[PDB]
Amino acid sequence: SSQYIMSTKDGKMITSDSKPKLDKTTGMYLYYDEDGREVMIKQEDVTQIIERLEHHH
């Protein structure tokens, strides 16, 4: 239900409907894209992970 957004050091922004899972072996954050499969983003490229809560449930 919560909405996730990741901010990239370069200034970009990325959304996801699932909590991105950090893979310490590769320092890669796995997450799911809109209408699609999983995708990868480097841990070091991510400045923050933002959770936006749902309240109208």
Alpha helix positions (H), the chain = none
- Beta strands in the chain, from DSSP E residues, in sequence order: 3-8, 13-16, 21-23, 28-32, 38-42, 46-52
CATH code assigned to 1-57: 2.30.30.100
Q: Which residue has the tokens 């449930």?
A: 57
- Domain regions of the chain by residue span: 1-57
Q: Resolution reached, in Å? A: 2.5
Q: In terms of DSSP bridges, do strands 13-16 and 3-8 run parallel, antiparallel, or are they unpaired?
A: antiparallel
d(CA 26, CA 11): 23
